[PDB]
Design a protein around this ligand. Structure first.
Ligand SMILES: *[C@@H]1O[C@H](CO)[C@@H](O[C@@H]2O[C@H](CO)[C@@H](O[C@@H]3O[C@H](CO[C@H]4O[C@H](CO)[C@@H](O)[C@H](O)[C@@H]4O[C@H]4O[C@H](CO)[C@@H](O)[C@H](O)[C@@H]4O)[C@@H](O)[C@H](O[C@H]4O[C@H](CO)[C@@H](O)[C@H](O)[C@@H]4O[C@H]4O[C@H](CO)[C@@H](O)[C@H](O)[C@@H]4O)[C@@H]3O)[C@H](O)[C@H]2NC(C)=O)[C@H](O)[C@H]1NC(C)=O
Ligand SMILES: *[C@@H]1O[C@H](CO)[C@@H](O[C@@H]2O[C@H](CO)[C@@H](O[C@@H]3O[C@H](CO[C@H]4O[C@H](CO)[C@@H](O)[C@H](O)[C@@H]4O[C@H]4O[C@H](CO)[C@@H](O)[C@H](O)[C@@H]4O)[C@@H](O)[C@H](O[C@H]4O[C@H](CO)[C@@H](O)[C@H](O)[C@@H]4O[C@H]4O[C@H](CO)[C@@H](O)[C@H](O)[C@@H]4O)[C@@H]3O)[C@H](O)[C@H]2NC(C)=O)[C@H](O)[C@H]1NC(C)=O
Ligand SMILES: *[C@@H]1O[C@H](CO)[C@@H](O[C@@H]2O[C@H](CO)[C@@H](O[C@@H]3O[C@H](CO[C@H]4O[C@H](CO)[C@@H](O)[C@H](O)[C@@H]4O)[C@@H](O)[C@H](O[C@H]4O[C@H](CO)[C@@H](O)[C@H](O)[C@@H]4O)[C@@H]3O)[C@H](O)[C@H]2NC(C)=O)[C@H](O)[C@H]1NC(C)=O
Ligand SMILES: *[C@@H]1O[C@H](CO)[C@@H](O[C@@H]2O[C@H](CO)[C@@H](O[C@@H]3O[C@H](CO[C@H]4O[C@H](CO)[C@@H](O)[C@H](O)[C@@H]4O)[C@@H](O)[C@H](O[C@H]4O[C@H](CO)[C@@H](O)[C@H](O)[C@@H]4O)[C@@H]3O)[C@H](O)[C@H]2NC(C)=O)[C@H](O)[C@H]1NC(C)=O
Ligand SMILES: *[C@@H]1O[C@H](CO)[C@@H](O[C@@H]2O[C@H](CO)[C@@H](O[C@@H]3O[C@H](CO)[C@@H](O)[C@H](O[C@H]4O[C@H](CO)[C@@H](O)[C@H](O)[C@@H]4O)[C@@H]3O)[C@H](O)[C@H]2NC(C)=O)[C@H](O)[C@H]1NC(C)=O
Ligand SMILES: *[C@@H]1O[C@H](CO)[C@@H](O[C@@H]2O[C@H](CO)[C@@H](O[C@@H]3O[C@H](CO)[C@@H](O)[C@H](O)[C@@H]3O)[C@H](O)[C@H]2NC(C)=O)[C@H](O)[C@H]1NC(C)=O
Ligand SMILES: CC(=O)N[C@H]1[C@H]([C@H](O)[C@H](O)CO)O[C@@](O[C@@H]2[C@@H](O)[C@H](O)O[C@H](CO)[C@@H]2O)(C(=O)O)C[C@@H]1O
Ligand SMILES: Nc1nc(=O)c2nc(CNc3ccc(C(=O)N[C@@H](CCC(=O)O)C(=O)O)cc3)cnc2[nH]1
Ligand SMILES: *[C@@H]1O[C@H](CO)[C@@H](O[C@@H]2O[C@H](CO)[C@@H](O)[C@H](O)[C@H]2NC(C)=O)[C@H](O)[C@H]1NC(C)=O
Ligand SMILES: *[C@@H]1O[C@H](CO)[C@@H](O[C@@H]2O[C@H](CO)[C@@H](O)[C@H](O)[C@H]2NC(C)=O)[C@H](O)[C@H]1NC(C)=O
Ligand SMILES: *[C@@H]1O[C@H](CO)[C@@H](O[C@@H]2O[C@H](CO)[C@@H](O)[C@H](O)[C@H]2NC(C)=O)[C@H](O)[C@H]1NC(C)=O
Ligand SMILES: *[C@@H]1O[C@H](CO)[C@@H](O[C@@H]2O[C@H](CO)[C@@H](O)[C@H](O)[C@H]2NC(C)=O)[C@H](O)[C@H]1NC(C)=O
Ligand SMILES: *[C@@H]1O[C@H](CO)[C@@H](O)[C@H](O)[C@H]1NC(C)=O
Ligand SMILES: *[C@@H]1O[C@H](CO)[C@@H](O)[C@H](O)[C@H]1NC(C)=O
Ligand SMILES: *[C@@H]1O[C@H](CO)[C@@H](O)[C@H](O)[C@H]1NC(C)=O
Ligand SMILES: *[C@@H]1O[C@H](CO)[C@@H](O)[C@H](O)[C@H]1NC(C)=O
Ligand SMILES: *[C@@H]1O[C@H](CO)[C@@H](O)[C@H](O)[C@H]1NC(C)=O
Ligand SMILES: *[C@@H]1O[C@H](CO)[C@@H](O)[C@H](O)[C@H]1NC(C)=O
Lengths: 404, 137, 97, 455, 48, 49, 48
């Protein structure tokens, strides 16, 4: 920016390595020297994908008979299957579908180790009682979602023509659950744990007969003694049954085999892209790398082989082969710059020139912009390493000189 | 390489410029340290080392074999990973890591680079060899 | 007697190995810290982006940034300490020669 | 529900002789972590040729566990009689995080026939039977070991060729020597080798059928079987429970000779298992053909950090329990089985509480009466009750109203009703429910801007 | 509507749920031992 | 732990962790600076003796 | 001693291993410094 504010000169900081240098010092004039700059990135040339492909995950149970009350929720656990939430959501009039610790787009598109679906009858009038922040009876004694795993909650109404789902007489819930200790002075509220059933489930009937019913069980000594007690409550039934569906997903306890179905192209196979840098998604595991055919190590049944820094370093494919996985590797870059001549050369340290006058292979890497001179110096200003030096022609190209 | 991250990284100021400049200076410091140290070991005048140097005093241990015998032994007995200054990039692809926690191959993965020293081995050997020949005189 | 001296009882020899080990430790900080999540759901930026929307995605990426910026600052601080020490040591070597 | 075959039609159970003295043996086989005993392999991945620490459910180094041994029943020559068992059905344990079992460790050694201490025989592997569930209590005569509601039963059958897992309600039968009948001692399973273990056709329901003599199986939700190839190889079995169900682990399908356990099944058991017991088993052998059966050992699991040594082939052959002792802590901190000589600081030996002391204000109830009398104020004229030095009970107040929406901020729900405070301030007012959202922190409407705002 | 605001340390935290006390939770009876404590809302571990 | 549930409890514990990890890193950095200084000083003491 | 904290601490990597190793080395340094210093103050011959 000039004094009058106009821009008269600029550097595109991603144009080349010399430009990166000027930008890092925020100046158009930097001192002579050899500087490290951002590496020349390897970029993906394609992608490989492997997903479980097969059986649909089965939501049929959900659709047949009278759903349980909130404290007796039923659980469907899906593993090794193709999921489709639209397939289930489309059967209900959804009133409220929200997600936590997972985006909306993600819930319907990511692969999981497992998907757990908890379904139950639930009045919509008590919607708020399922909130994480709630201190009412549902969240304290009946049903609580995980705080650790990503979850979604769907509240939906059963359509008049979905005749396979029947209604209970009333909606019901536990409004009290507690233990009376052996002294019969102290009463301890028994709160429901996330993803678990309340201890009072065994004393509370599948339908509370009437609001205010009190239940009691004498506990054995192995259960700590005393009494387990509970109180039920009811909500009048609606014209259409309202149901809640909790969804909990886990991301890495097993192969993430619960995936949306995918139509596979045969150009996304690993064997067809060996040696290339590709993006990968293997049963929910993703990143970038290069696959190589190699000797199997690790336990085959476990599929993914990790190193001591927890990187994925190998994989057993469903095509029967074991592949080594290497990172797409970046190519080191150092800029050799001479301020007086306004010239430069690029050193790719540690890199053979097969990956890059043409390029010159030197003891410290491959260098472009230098010409081999078979000349010696003592007075080296731009040392390259080992006993090599860049020597400006003064302008011409820099010479590669040896230090005497 | 993730753009969202880079976008957030920018809000921390010129963080990476500081990292690079601090290391650049720290690295120049060794080239200057080495240059100064060797300038001082350097002899003005020296006698040639010939087999038999030392007379009745057995100095074959120190005579260049070129590094001396003790010098090669010192290096052979120390476990040092090979940084691959000329083609390490490729060694780590065609062979892969030597072992668990291979910090040389980690360079191309993690984003760091080990730079070569200011002088090659034969030059350093030349300095101490000329030094040996200068001692008596 | 010294030809066979580069062993476990040679203090000068261990100092040579330790200088080598110190270089390795310096590099191990960078190699080992990228696997940390620093409270994030994943050490992978790609996993964060794939799973979360921007208002939360941001917070998770930011945890990884803070952890990595911290790691690099620690690394640099040590390279400066180690290079200062080596430089003083180099002047001692100069005096001994 | 699942059809699990017909009910037993017998009017009586076989009499069970419980003589614990005969089963009080000392044959210790504690977990040797250095030999990787009891280890469940990290589940979602493998590693090769590395040493790392890992957090997971592991048995403790040195844990002796609980030894159980099955025996031959009583006989007279060629006619087997009464069953002979240990007091196992009444010995109900807390499940906690699950357990691992060492099975057949003594196989091929010469052992004892438990029922006849002077009789020796080659030891053969036998599989453990388990009963697991959410609730326990007693039977009709007061003996313990009854499980209520759905109970998970892991019952090996077919003379050791199948594992049968089922989740069902066990209804005690009322016949002679049965749990709801007369002269009951303990239920037990059995098989009769003479008719059940023919060289060719093994009776795959022999143990199920004996189980059924003591209980009627009702509302079974599942019954699964797993096949076991016969051998005399030491194997490990394990059980854990998560939100996904009960996980059954075994070494025999992946690392038969090595011993690492891998998951082979998940059962749709979602209620929490709190209790388990060993179902005693007695073999109705003839007197002339009694065998020595190997003892099995049950070890409890807990969330421990182990140093795990993964071989090139990925199996764990060696490990360190990082909390066992100070030396183990050292190895774990360097993530190595070999550390240099020296003197190192390690975690301190913690003092642990030996009890607790509590002092609370005890006295007057905090008084919410004002709240209940007269017309409540409008939202901008809210009234405030400040409670200090009193005993509070929110249920006492909440129970008087039909609560439509109760939420908390910067305090958990459990905490609001259970913690002590310097003060509790209660602001009450009339408020239409139709304007519920206007009280939200994020609201920019008239209530939050001009009438009432929370801290 | 009922708003509830709670404060945790301006005074002795004397607004507590009622508790039935055992006499083995007294301080005098456990001197010299490491115990957990909860004293008018103040808690931690220590030796009295 | 006594006051908050996991999604918020976590954030609060994490603040304490970050502060304590920072403190320990600062401590260690200084013990390394101070021990390096003392070691140089010890060699000065050696020369003076 | 709180398990929840320890669980979260693990997500920061082997933090404590680094603290312990750094101090262990720093502490060895003084024992070596002292040993070397005294080895040099030590006399070969001395009068009472
Ligand atoms: C996850 O789960 C969800 C839910 O299960 C899946 O989403 C469904 O996907 C299917 C496709 O696989 C999709 O079917 C499509 O429906 C449209 C809508 O047509 C309806 O209305 C027209 C009005 O004119 C009617 O004529 C027609 O018959 C349909 O009527 C329906 O409703 C009436 C009552 O009102 C009933 O009486 C009817 O029986 C019927 O139920 C169709 O137009 C569409 O047809 C095209 O594809 C089929 C493929 O078989 C092909 O045969 C047709 O000729 C036509 O294809 C031509 O046109 C397309 C462009 O549209 C072009 O690409 C082709 O090349 C041809 O030129 C088809 O039947 C269904 O609606 C989706 N449902 C929901 C809720 O989303 C989702 O796919 C799953 N995900 C995964 C990964 O599996
Ligand atoms: C915080 O504030 C809350 C709210 O104020 C406190 O919670 C209350 O705690 C009391 C106990 O202190 C609890 O009372 C118990 O109620 C049950 C329910 O019985 C009702 O239904 C049965 C149906 O058969 C009726 O028969 C019975 O009369 C009750 O009917 C009520 O409603 C009808 C209208 O429908 C009215 O006409 C009635 O008058 C009545 O209001 C009782 O079963 C229970 O009884 C047991 O305890 C009493 C103690 O005095 C004892 O005398 C009884 O014999 C019986 O004890 C035996 O059984 C227990 C096991 O249950 C065993 O442990 C004993 O050893 C004996 O063998 C008692 O009356 C009330 O319901 C709670 N309310 C709420 C909303 O939670 C809370 O305690 C406070 N916290 C603190 C720390 O103080
Ligand atoms: C988890 O497991 C537990 C333990 O098995 C179950 O609790 C048992 O529940 C059953 C019933 O659900 C109890 O059995 C009997 O229930 C009768 C209920 O009476 C009504 O229904 C009967 C049906 O025929 C009608 O005839 C009657 O008119 C009523 O309409 C009680 O009346 C019975 O009482 C008898 O025993 C008592 C004992 O004191 C005597 O005082 C009575 O006079 C009479 O003889 C009996 O209670 C059974 O007792 C409960 N067991 C225990 C240990 O408490 C849980 O239900 C199960 N949970 C779930 C969710 O499935
Ligand atoms: C009671 O007695 C029985 C036998 O009477 C013992 O069973 C033997 O146990 C040993 C050790 O577990 C088994 O030996 C292992 O055999 C494996 C495969 O053997 C099969 O395949 C090889 C060819 O690959 C054949 O030559 C062999 O005959 C079998 O057909 C080997 O792979 C194992 O080697 C692996 O482990 C060893 C270390 O143990 C490594 O050194 C190897 O490199 C390799 O990793 C091993 O050799 C033996 O086969 C079992 N017998 C039977 C019949 O199966 C019971 O263990 C014993 N019970 C008790 C409690 O002691
Ligand atoms: C030994 O144990 C096994 C358990 O592993 C047990 O297996 C059960 O056998 C019964 C049959 O004896 C199976 O029940 C059948 O399953 C088929 C499945 O298609 C049904 O079609 C059959 O229905 C017909 O018969 C019914 C009999 O009442 C009629 O009511 C019905 O209307 C039909 O006519 C029937 O349900 C059962 O599923 C398996 N169970 C398992 C878990 O595999 C076996 O019976 C035991 N054997 C003995 C001798 O006890
Ligand atoms: C000056 O000193 C050097 C050593 O510093 C002497 O050379 C050494 O001579 C010995 C002979 O006893 C060699 O031993 C041989 O070692 C090999 C090792 O495999 C063994 O196979 C032979 O059988 C024999 O034991 C020793 O290696 C050799 N060392 C070197 C570096 O050459 C040298 O002779 C001395 N000169 C004079 C004039 O004394
Ligand atoms: C648990 C128990 O009581 N064991 C008895 C045992 C059994 O009663 C018997 O094996 C049933 O078949 O009997 C013991 O005594 C035996 C005599 O009763 C039998 O007459 O002859 C046996 C030797 O052939 C032996 O003498 C036994 O087997 O040791 C006594 C034991 O306590
Ligand atoms: N029916 C039957 N089943 C068996 O399992 C059985 N086992 C034995 C032998 N059992 C054992 C088990 C361990 C040791 C043993 O050598 N233990 C060591 C101590 C091990 C330790 O505590 O670290 C010892 O020296 O006693 C001996 C015999 C004998 N008869 C049997 N009979
Ligand atoms: C498993 O890891 C060990 C390291 O613990 C490897 O052994 C090293 O192999 C290299 C090969 O050049 C030698 O230079 C090292 O000196 C060996 N170290 C030790 C401790 O022996 C072993 O080869 C690895 N096995 C496989 C199949 O990769
Ligand atoms: C079942 O038998 C076992 C084993 O004999 C009993 O456990 C023993 O109980 C005594 C009681 O003083 C203890 O001293 C022993 O140390 C216990 N043994 C073991 C191995 O722990 C058990 O209590 C009996 N259970 C029932 C219900 O009768
Ligand atoms: C176990 O299954 C039975 C049948 O599927 C359930 O239904 C009862 O069956 C008995 C059979 O004699 C009938 O007399 C009852 O009237 C039936 N009750 C109902 C409500 O239909 C039984 O409820 C199931 N038990 C459990 C605990 O699920
Ligand atoms: C578990 O083992 C049983 C018994 O070997 C298998 O059942 C046999 O399957 C064959 C298949 O041709 C039939 O011919 C036999 O008649 C079956 N036997 C019986 C007793 O039914 C069973 O399939 C095996 N299970 C698995 C999962 O492999
Ligand atoms: C149910 O199906 C009948 C069939 O004619 C249709 O007329 C009716 O509108 C459908 N109802 C709903 C709610 O879709
Ligand atoms: C690869 O995909 C093409 C797409 O049409 C198909 O024609 C070809 O047969 C496929 N090859 C194999 C091996 O399936
Ligand atoms: C991988 O290598 C093995 C042997 O080294 C070979 O037989 C196999 O076919 C190769 N697989 C591929 C995909 O090239
Ligand atoms: C430059 O050319 C000379 C030819 O004499 C050759 O020996 C030397 O190795 C070359 N240097 C490089 C880096 O190629
Ligand atoms: C447990 O025992 C008591 C007396 O011993 C008896 O009254 C009670 O009914 C028993 N419980 C069961 C479930 O039979
Ligand atoms: C301590 O508690 C017991 C419990 O029954 C009681 O009997 C005893 O009198 C109490 N002691 C005092 C000093 O109150």
């Amino acid at each position: 920016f000039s004094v009058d504010g106009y821009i008269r000169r600029a550097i595109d900081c991603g144009f080349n390595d010399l430009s990166q240098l000027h930008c890092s010092y925020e100046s158009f004039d930097v001192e002579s020297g050899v500087y490290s700059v951002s590496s020349f990135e390897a970029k993906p040339s394609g992608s490989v994908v492997e997903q479980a492909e097969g059986v649909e995950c089965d939501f049929s149970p959900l659709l047949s008979g009278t759903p349980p009350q909130v404290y007796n929720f039923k659980r469907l656990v899906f593993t090794n299957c193709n999921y489709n939430l639209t397939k289930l959501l489309s059967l209900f009039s959804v009133n409220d579908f929200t997600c936590s610790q997972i985006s909306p787009a993600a819930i319907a598109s990511n692969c999981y180790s497992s998907l757990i679906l908890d379904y139950f009858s639930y009045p919509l009038s008590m919607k708020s009682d399922l909130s994480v922040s709630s201190a009412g009876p549902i969240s304290q004694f009946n049903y609580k979602q995980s705080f650790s795993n990503p979850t979604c909650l769907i509240l939906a109404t059963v359509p008049h023509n979905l005749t396979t789902i029947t209604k209970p007489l009333k909606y019901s819930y536990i409004n009290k659950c507690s233990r009376l200790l052996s002294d019969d002075r102290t009463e301890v509220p028994q709160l429901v744990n996330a993803n678990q059933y309340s201890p009072c489930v065994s004393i509370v009937p599948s339908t509370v007969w009437e609001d205010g019913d009190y239940y009691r069980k004498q506990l054995s000594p192995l259960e700590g003694g005393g009494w387990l007690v509970a109180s039920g409550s009811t909500v009048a039934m609606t014209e259409q049954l309202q149901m809640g569906f909790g969804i909990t997903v886990q991301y890495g306890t097993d192969t993430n085999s619960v995936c949306p179905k995918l139509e596979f192209a045969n150009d996304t196979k690993i064997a067809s892209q060996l040696g290339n840098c590709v993006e990968y998604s293997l049963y929910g595991v993703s990143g970038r790398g290069v696959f190589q055919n190699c000797t199997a190590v690790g336990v085959r049944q476990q599929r993914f082989v990790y190193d001591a820094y927890q990187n994925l370093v190998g994989y057993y494919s469903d095509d029967g082969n074991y592949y080594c996985l290497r990172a797409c590797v970046s190519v080191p870059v150092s800029v050799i710059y001479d301020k007086e001549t306004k010239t430069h050369a690029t050193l790719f340290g540690s890199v053979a020139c097969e990956h890059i006058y043409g390029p010159l292979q030197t003891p410290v890497g491959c260098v472009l912009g230098l010409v081999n001179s078979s000349l010696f110096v003592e007075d080296c200003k731009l040392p390259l390493g080992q006993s090599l030096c860049a020597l400006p022609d003064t302008p011409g190209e820099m010479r590669l000189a040896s230090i005497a | 390489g993730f753009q969202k991250c880079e976008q957030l990284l920018r809000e921390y100021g010129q963080f990476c410029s500081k990292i690079n400049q601090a290391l650049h200076g720290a690295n120049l410091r060794q080239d200057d340290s080495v240059r100064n140290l060797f300038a001082s070991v350097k002899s003005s005048q020296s006698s040639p080392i010939i087999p038999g140097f030392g007379g009745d005093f057995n100095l074959t241990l120190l005579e260049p074999v070129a590094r001396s015998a003790i010098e090669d032994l010192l290096f052979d007995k120390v476990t040092i990973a090979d940084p691959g200054y000329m083609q390490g990039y490729d060694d780590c692809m065609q062979q892969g890591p030597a072992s668990a926690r291979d910090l040389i191959c980690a360079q191309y993965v993690a984003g760091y680079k080990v730079l070569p020293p200011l002088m090659d081995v034969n030059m350093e050997a030349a300095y101490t060899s000329s030094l040996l020949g200068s001692i008596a005189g | 007697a010294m030809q066979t001296g580069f062993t476990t009882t040679n203090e000068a020899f261990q100092k040579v190995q330790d200088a080598v080990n110190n270089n390795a430790q310096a590099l191990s900080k960078l190699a080992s810290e990228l696997s940390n999540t620093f409270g994030a759901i994943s050490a992978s930026i790609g996993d964060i982006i794939q799973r979360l929307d921007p208002p939360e995605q941001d917070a998770q990426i930011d945890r990884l940034i803070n952890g990595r910026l911290t790691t690099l600052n620690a690394f640099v601080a040590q390279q400066l300490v180690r290079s200062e020490s080596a430089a003083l040591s180099a002047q001692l070597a100069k005096d001994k020669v | 529900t699942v059809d699990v075959g017909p009910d037993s039609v017998k009017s009586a159970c076989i009499e069970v002789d419980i003589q614990q003295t005969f089963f009080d043996k000392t044959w210790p086989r504690p977990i040797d972590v250095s030999k990787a005993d009891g280890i469940i392999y990290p589940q979602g991945r493998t590693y090769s040729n590395i040493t790392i620490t890992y957090q997971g459910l592991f048995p403790y180094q040195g844990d002796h566990g609980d030894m159980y041994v099955y025996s031959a029943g009583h006989a007279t020559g060629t006619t087997p009689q009464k069953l002979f068992v240990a007091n196992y059905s009444q010995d109900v344990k807390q499940f906690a995080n699950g357990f691992v079992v060492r099975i057949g460790a003594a196989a091929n050694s010469t052992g004892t026939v438990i029922i006849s201490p002077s009789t020796s025989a080659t030891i053969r592997k036998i599989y453990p039977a388990f009963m697991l569930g959410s609730s326990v209590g007693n039977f009709s005569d007061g003996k313990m070991g009854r499980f209520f509601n759905h109970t998970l039963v892991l019952l090996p059958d077919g003379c050791g060729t199948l594992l049968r897992a089922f989740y069902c309600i066990l209804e005690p039968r009322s016949g002679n020597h049965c749990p709801a009948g007369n002269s009951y001692t303990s239920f037990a399973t059995y098989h009769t080798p003479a008719t059940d273990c023919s060289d060719g056709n093994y009776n795959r329901n022999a143990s199920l059928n004996s189980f059924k003599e003591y209980f009627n199986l009702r509302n079974c939700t599942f019954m699964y079987t797993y096949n076991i190839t016969e051998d005399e190889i030491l194997e490990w079995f394990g059980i854990t429970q998560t939100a996904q169900g009960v996980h059954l682990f075994s070494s025999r399908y992946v690392d038969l000779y090595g011993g690492n356990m891998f998951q082979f099944a998940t059962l749709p058991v979602y209620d929490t298992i709190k209790y388990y017991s060993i179902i005693p088993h007695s073999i109705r052998s003839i007197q002339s053909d009694r065998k020595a059966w190997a003892a099995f050992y049950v070890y409890k699991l807990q969330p421990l950090t182990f140093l795990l040594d993964f071989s090139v082939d990925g199996y764990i052959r060696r490990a360190i329990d990082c909390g066992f002792n100070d030396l183990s802590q050292l190895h774990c901190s360097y993530e190595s089985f070999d550390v240099e000589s020296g003197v190192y600081s390690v975690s301190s030996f913690e003092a642990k509480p030996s009890g607790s002391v509590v002092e609370q204000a005890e006295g007057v109830e905090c008084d919410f009466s004002p709240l209940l009398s007269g017309t409540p104020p409008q939202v901008y004229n809210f009234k405030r009750l400040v409670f200090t030095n009193c005993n509070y009970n929110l249920t006492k107040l909440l129970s008087l109203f039909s609560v439509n929406d109760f939420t908390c901020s910067q305090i958990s729900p459990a905490a609001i009703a259970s913690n002590c405070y310097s003060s509790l301030i209660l602001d009450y007012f009339s408020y239409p429910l139709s304007m519920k959202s206007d009280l939200s922190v994020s609201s920019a409407g008239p209530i939050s801007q001009f009438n009432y705002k929370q801290s």
